[PDB]
Amino acid sequence: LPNITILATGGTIAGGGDSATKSNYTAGKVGVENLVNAVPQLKDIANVKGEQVVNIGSQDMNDDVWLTLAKKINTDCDKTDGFVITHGTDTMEETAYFLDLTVKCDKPVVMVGAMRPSTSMSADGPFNLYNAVVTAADKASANRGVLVVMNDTVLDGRDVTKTNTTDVATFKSVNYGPLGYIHNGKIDYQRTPARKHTSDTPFDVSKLNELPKVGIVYNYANASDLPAKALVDAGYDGIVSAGVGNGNLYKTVFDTLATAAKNGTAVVRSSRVPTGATTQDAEVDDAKYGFVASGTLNPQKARVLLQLALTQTKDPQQIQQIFNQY
Amino acid sequence: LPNITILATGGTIAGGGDSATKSNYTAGKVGVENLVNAVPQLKDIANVKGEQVVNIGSQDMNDDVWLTLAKKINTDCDKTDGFVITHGTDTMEETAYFLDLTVKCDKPVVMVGAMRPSTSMSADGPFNLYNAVVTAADKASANRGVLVVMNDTVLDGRDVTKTNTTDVATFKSVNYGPLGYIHNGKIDYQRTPARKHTSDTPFDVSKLNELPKVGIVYNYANASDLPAKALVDAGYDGIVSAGVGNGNLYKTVFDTLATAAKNGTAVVRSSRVPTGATTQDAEVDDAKYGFVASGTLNPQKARVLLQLALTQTKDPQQIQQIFNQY
Amino acid sequence: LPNITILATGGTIAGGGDSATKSNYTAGKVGVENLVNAVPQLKDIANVKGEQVVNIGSQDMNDDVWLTLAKKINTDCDKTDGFVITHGTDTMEETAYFLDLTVKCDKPVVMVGAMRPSTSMSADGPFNLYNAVVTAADKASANRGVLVVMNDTVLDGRDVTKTNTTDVATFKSVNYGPLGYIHNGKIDYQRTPARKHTSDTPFDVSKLNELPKVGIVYNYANASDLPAKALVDAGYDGIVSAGVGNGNLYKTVFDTLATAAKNGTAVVRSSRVPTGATTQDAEVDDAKYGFVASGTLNPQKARVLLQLALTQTKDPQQIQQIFNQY
Amino acid sequence: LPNITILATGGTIAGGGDSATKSNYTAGKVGVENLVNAVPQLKDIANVKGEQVVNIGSQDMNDDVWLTLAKKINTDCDKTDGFVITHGTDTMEETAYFLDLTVKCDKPVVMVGAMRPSTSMSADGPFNLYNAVVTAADKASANRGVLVVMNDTVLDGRDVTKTNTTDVATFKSVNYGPLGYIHNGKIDYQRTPARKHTSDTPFDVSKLNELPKVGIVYNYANASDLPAKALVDAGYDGIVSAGVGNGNLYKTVFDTLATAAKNGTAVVRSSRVPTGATTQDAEVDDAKYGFVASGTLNPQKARVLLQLALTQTKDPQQIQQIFNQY
Ligand SMILES: N[C@@H](CC(=O)O)C(=O)O
Ligand SMILES: N[C@@H](CC(=O)O)C(=O)O
Ligand SMILES: N[C@@H](CC(=O)O)C(=O)O
Ligand SMILES: N[C@@H](CC(=O)O)C(=O)O
């Protein structure tokens, strides 16, 4: 049986409430070996080893843990046959894309969480964690970039996103679809991500202890330019605009980010709209203002790429190319 | 034939590019009578009169235009049999909910836009505008609150939202579904919004020239508390948190909004997640920090209600009740 | 606590299997007592009387079980506070609609099943049962017709359909959306069905012990009319066509059915297309051939309403108006 | 500019109607020249040779037109740069899959239709045609199999299906997502089909002028096996079952088909459920009865692959492996 290392970071998959019937719970309580012992059938499909990296609710995920996960996955890559990362659902779509771009290891990395706590009735963590190692063990899962496995479905780390606040079926690749479906511990893979990932990227965080500062501003009717200017005043390396519609900006935010871009801040236009690309050649003349168009990357995903792009260049057209390739 | 007044504000429905084949265009160019003359079959179903309120791209929509629209709709209510508001798609879901809560007139108000410019091949504006007056003319459309009509579908102004950056079918009531479908100028209505609206609300903006200041902060891995503190320092009456998952907050943003709430700022927890409620009784003790849980209201919709709630009270539990009722 | 009668008919919620990690299992085998005992937390919210009606896979469901269920509910209506029906998921949408038209009890009737069998890992049946009882217990669930509660969602019996072959979240009201969502044992209702149901229908199943025979025929490329004739030589009271697109029929099947509509057998146009209404005034002149267009009712749900409409009149224009109101 | 052959078979893209505001219309009436002339902007991107193959409503589509289309494409393959096929939307998913398995040309084959007829307001056919030609013209569209381009989206022939009866956005690859989106006449491809298509299949339609007879039977509550026997006494080479749930069959239909699978006629288990795979190792022992599980192929698409698999072998275990690879 393959060697599968589990890397625990926290989440509701490791959370607990005082009742199987009530909704109140605290996140990231359960230790990693407790998670594994709850699913004794893991011994049938893999030889599992658990390591605790952190134990937090993923609403507190940060640059520090991202670097830690990437380096540990890269350096211990030949010690095991695959990795499963237990993680909170709240930001798992951010971590999954960050590792998608910084993991040089060639063996499958699968992220899992749970939408119901360990203690809840019909908790989903157990079958989720099982199906994650079924995926990390499958040699067919290799060469697909970093994966997210939830609700009997394998999802690529670029497009996967949390679509619903409470539903067990919340995670979807809302733009390009899942890579394959899990039935009875077997996977029928019919897709792979075309965008470049893992060792195919030039992002090397192995010597990095920081990440460039990138923030996100929201656009809406009558939006304040103060969030944008606060990030400008703090000397942020990049700002991601969660625009309206096809990446559009309220006029005052427009004015602020246009000025920051000419004075050196990298500005990426994404959108609050849950599906579809922020394109070029719509209402905003990106070439003129040195803006970068995020494509199908939502704001928090656009932040992941813009941070890593900023470790390579500060030229907007170089960054636009990175946003067209990864 | 019924009297239908069209109130034009701008949008891509009134936008133009130099080619039916290229995607570049400027928004809010076309005058309101030009829109009507493009659809001469309007004369078959209604006696239409057009008035120009503004001509902007709805990414620039603001409190000023909202007040103007509400007052004009309220005071001219008995002059016509129905209203159709042509409007940009980018923020139409915000205007539609604002009018949903401030319109005292009892006759149908229908908002329309277009995802392709007037000049584009297979432009959608014409049939959209037609189907909007078909809806404003139908007496069955009354008593349903303010409506949004797009792609042969009637949508309630609370739940309707822009789901895709470019698709003609972008607008959906992603939580509770549409009220009815349009076929051949007839509507088969099978639903109506349970939440209270229009004259059933206590919101009266008829003497108001301002709206309370409410901003929106985004949550993500490693999020800066600077947007939140900038809005605090400006003395904002309310802040809407676009949380992660079920309304959760990054720890530093948490700290800032908890403090603002105890010192008088109204704080509403919404979510970046495109569907589903930000509930109470999950990970955040709302009663303790005087936070308000937004339910199914997304951040920009939660801003609309919190602004209007702030014209009635500053007590968090009074505001939570408003968020449970409207 | 309220008195809740659980009526058990089988399903994979009562389904077996030799292993929590394998899919091979048998359906409709566990009894209602073992189902109730498996969820002891029912004892705190409701007073559940388990009654076994039959114990079958719902793929083998039929008119008999339908009739007995409708009778049993109407008879026992005033000796309980609500009903829960445990059912297989394959045909749950048809039973739910049948009872949605036949039951005359004005108290909640809620159906529930499970997509994973009792013995599987992370099995969904227990929380499903719990939430179904919560809904049957809720005062607000009355007067909304027969309900289906699955995956934390309350779905009206008319529009609810099985959307996916294996997903725990398979049930959706794909046309008009759900009625409300269940969180922490509380429901927030924001919709009710507009079509007449339960108590305001004219159907009366009380005396009948057999139901007019209606079959279903599938349109496709190079469709054979052998199934369509097979049902008319056997003298079926009516046929429902699973047409292509907007309820259109192939060459052969069109002719066989146009013969039939004139010589007695009432035929109904529905569609194999999972969402959207079969409209009249499209390609097919229903008035010319005496056809009936089903609207949003899919084929298995069109058969339910025709069977029953055939117990009232065989006039096509009489039937169409029942399809426009129920 | 590239040479693009447009092959016209009809559809509501060639459909009539007396009024832009009414739905009554007739299908497959406009010729290919009037279709091309209606989109003069084609002249700038492609060199379109219009060829009329037939002019029919695709509800009346059949094997003949399929065979002639496959032959015509394979024969003329090297006298053009790509093919566009204008088609009705009702059966477009079946033709697209047939050709996806039969054509041996390694140049783009793209199908297109319209949900609104040529003469309607805001008719979608022109931009649809334009974008289909864009896709047929694109160098990157080769080696992805037969494509369907509808509503600015490139969809693989296998998974694409008509999702809604009237929506202009009805076509979706409901299981694995689309291949790419078209904006401003450029496509961003991020997926290709993994299942073997076009040139790497073993099918050869060149000599054949008739196709093994396969019918489809619909499972539901109290299902009649009269359609299922009708096809076996008429000696059909195989039947596809539109089963309930995960490809399950009613009492009667199970027995008739278990008889059949043994006495020659190969039967295939598919499902009436719009999304998700009919799996083996569930409730039905396919190995015991010599059944075949279709996977994600819906019924009309299972019939396409069986018809063709029946021109190769009648062994069930031979057929299942073709269903696991094509
Ligand atoms: N707040 C939790 C939510 C979850 O895990 O589902 C987390 O992300 O850790
Ligand atoms: N930016 C435009 C987009 C549209 O109308 O579709 C607007 O909202 O006015
Ligand atoms: N075959 C099962 C399907 C299920 O319950 O999930 C039934 O309907 O009984
Ligand atoms: N009945 C039409 C449907 C369409 O094209 O929209 C056809 O398939 O030809």
Side-chain angles (χ1 to χ4, degrees), chain A residues 11-13 25 27 56-59 87-91 114-115 162, chain B residues 248 283:
Chain A
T12 298
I13 190 171
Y25 75 97
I56 66 181
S58 86
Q59 69 261 48
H87 190 291
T89 68
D90 283 1
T91 52
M115 293 299 283
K162 184 166 195 182
Chain B
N248 289 311
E283 282 169 79

Short mmCIF file of all heavy atoms in Angstrom, two decimals, chain A residues 11-13 25 27 56-59 87-91 114-115 162, chain B residues 248 283, ligand 1:
data_model
loop_
_atom_site.label_atom_id
_atom_site.label_comp_id
_atom_site.label_asym_id
_atom_site.label_seq_id
_atom_site.Cartn_x
_atom_site.Cartn_y
_atom_site.Cartn_z
N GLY A 11 -9.20 23.55 10.67
CA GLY A 11 -10.47 23.45 9.98
C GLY A 11 -11.58 22.83 10.79
O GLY A 11 -11.42 22.38 11.93
N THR A 12 -12.78 22.84 10.18
CA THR A 12 -13.95 22.24 10.81
C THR A 12 -13.86 20.73 10.78
O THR A 12 -14.41 20.05 11.66
CB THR A 12 -15.22 22.73 10.12
OG1 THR A 12 -15.34 24.15 10.28
CG2 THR A 12 -16.47 22.07 10.69
N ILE A 13 -13.13 20.18 9.80
CA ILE A 13 -12.82 18.75 9.79
C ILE A 13 -12.16 18.34 11.09
O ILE A 13 -12.28 17.18 11.52
CB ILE A 13 -11.94 18.43 8.57
CG1 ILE A 13 -11.79 16.91 8.39
CG2 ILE A 13 -10.58 19.12 8.68
CD1 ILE A 13 -11.11 16.54 7.09
N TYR A 25 -19.94 25.66 17.00
CA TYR A 25 -18.71 24.88 17.11
C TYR A 25 -17.49 25.79 17.04
O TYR A 25 -17.54 26.91 16.52
CB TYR A 25 -18.61 23.81 16.01
CG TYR A 25 -18.28 24.32 14.62
CD1 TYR A 25 -16.97 24.30 14.14
CD2 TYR A 25 -19.27 24.83 13.79
CE1 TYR A 25 -16.66 24.77 12.88
CE2 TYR A 25 -18.97 25.30 12.51
CZ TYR A 25 -17.67 25.27 12.06
OH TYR A 25 -17.38 25.73 10.79
N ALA A 27 -13.43 25.78 15.74
CA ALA A 27 -12.70 25.21 14.61
C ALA A 27 -11.27 24.88 15.02
O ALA A 27 -10.67 25.55 15.87
CB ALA A 27 -12.72 26.16 13.42
N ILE A 56 -5.43 25.85 13.28
CA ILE A 56 -6.15 27.11 13.27
C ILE A 56 -7.41 26.96 12.44
O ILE A 56 -7.57 26.01 11.67
CB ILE A 56 -5.29 28.27 12.75
CG1 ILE A 56 -4.96 28.09 11.26
CG2 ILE A 56 -4.00 28.40 13.56
CD1 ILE A 56 -4.09 29.18 10.71
N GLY A 57 -8.32 27.91 12.62
CA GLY A 57 -9.42 28.06 11.68
C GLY A 57 -8.89 28.78 10.47
O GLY A 57 -8.16 29.76 10.59
N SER A 58 -9.24 28.27 9.28
CA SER A 58 -8.63 28.81 8.08
C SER A 58 -9.04 30.25 7.79
O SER A 58 -8.44 30.87 6.91
CB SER A 58 -8.95 27.92 6.88
OG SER A 58 -10.18 28.26 6.28
N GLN A 59 -10.01 30.81 8.52
CA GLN A 59 -10.23 32.24 8.40
C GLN A 59 -9.04 33.03 8.91
O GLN A 59 -8.96 34.24 8.64
CB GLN A 59 -11.50 32.69 9.15
CG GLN A 59 -11.43 32.59 10.67
CD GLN A 59 -12.09 31.34 11.18
OE1 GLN A 59 -11.84 30.25 10.66
NE2 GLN A 59 -12.95 31.48 12.18
N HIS A 87 -7.66 20.88 6.25
CA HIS A 87 -7.64 22.34 6.14
C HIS A 87 -9.08 22.84 6.27
O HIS A 87 -10.03 22.15 5.87
CB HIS A 87 -7.01 22.75 4.79
CG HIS A 87 -6.71 24.21 4.62
ND1 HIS A 87 -7.70 25.17 4.51
CD2 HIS A 87 -5.54 24.87 4.47
CE1 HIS A 87 -7.14 26.35 4.33
NE2 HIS A 87 -5.83 26.20 4.30
N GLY A 88 -9.23 24.03 6.83
CA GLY A 88 -10.54 24.66 6.87
C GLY A 88 -11.05 25.04 5.49
O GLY A 88 -10.29 25.41 4.59
N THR A 89 -12.37 24.98 5.33
CA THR A 89 -12.97 25.26 4.03
C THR A 89 -12.94 26.75 3.70
O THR A 89 -12.94 27.12 2.52
CB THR A 89 -14.40 24.73 3.99
OG1 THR A 89 -15.22 25.48 4.88
CG2 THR A 89 -14.42 23.27 4.40
N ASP A 90 -12.86 27.62 4.71
CA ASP A 90 -13.04 29.06 4.48
C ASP A 90 -12.03 29.62 3.49
O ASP A 90 -12.40 30.37 2.58
CB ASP A 90 -12.96 29.83 5.80
CG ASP A 90 -14.23 29.71 6.61
OD1 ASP A 90 -15.16 29.01 6.16
OD2 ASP A 90 -14.32 30.32 7.68
N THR A 91 -10.75 29.27 3.63
CA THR A 91 -9.72 29.74 2.70
C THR A 91 -9.00 28.61 1.98
O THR A 91 -7.95 28.86 1.38
CB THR A 91 -8.67 30.59 3.42
OG1 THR A 91 -8.16 29.86 4.54
CG2 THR A 91 -9.23 31.94 3.86
N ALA A 114 -14.09 19.83 5.87
CA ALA A 114 -15.42 19.36 6.18
C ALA A 114 -16.31 20.56 6.43
O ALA A 114 -15.88 21.55 7.03
CB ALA A 114 -15.42 18.42 7.39
N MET A 115 -17.55 20.48 5.94
CA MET A 115 -18.54 21.52 6.19
C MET A 115 -19.36 21.27 7.45
O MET A 115 -20.06 22.18 7.90
CB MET A 115 -19.48 21.65 4.99
CG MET A 115 -18.80 22.20 3.74
SD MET A 115 -18.15 23.85 4.02
CE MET A 115 -19.66 24.83 3.92
N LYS A 162 -15.27 28.06 -3.02
CA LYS A 162 -16.38 27.81 -2.11
C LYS A 162 -17.62 28.56 -2.58
O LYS A 162 -17.67 29.79 -2.49
CB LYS A 162 -15.99 28.24 -0.70
CG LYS A 162 -17.05 27.92 0.35
CD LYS A 162 -16.52 28.06 1.78
CE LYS A 162 -17.46 27.39 2.76
NZ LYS A 162 -17.01 27.53 4.18
N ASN B 248 -17.14 34.53 8.37
CA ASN B 248 -16.03 34.61 9.30
C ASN B 248 -15.05 35.72 8.93
O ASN B 248 -15.02 36.23 7.80
CB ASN B 248 -15.31 33.27 9.37
CG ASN B 248 -16.14 32.22 10.07
OD1 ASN B 248 -16.67 32.46 11.16
ND2 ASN B 248 -16.27 31.05 9.45
N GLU B 283 -19.56 30.11 14.16
CA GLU B 283 -18.32 30.31 14.91
C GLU B 283 -18.25 31.66 15.63
O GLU B 283 -17.40 31.82 16.51
CB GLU B 283 -17.10 30.16 13.97
CG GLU B 283 -16.71 28.71 13.64
CD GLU B 283 -15.68 28.62 12.50
OE1 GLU B 283 -14.48 28.85 12.76
OE2 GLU B 283 -16.08 28.34 11.35
N1 LIG E 1 -14.00 28.47 9.67
C1 LIG E 1 -13.75 27.09 9.25
C2 LIG E 1 -14.82 26.62 8.25
C3 LIG E 1 -14.62 25.17 7.80
O1 LIG E 1 -13.55 24.56 8.05
O2 LIG E 1 -15.57 24.61 7.18
C4 LIG E 1 -12.36 27.00 8.65
O3 LIG E 1 -12.12 27.42 7.51
O4 LIG E 1 -11.45 26.49 9.29
#
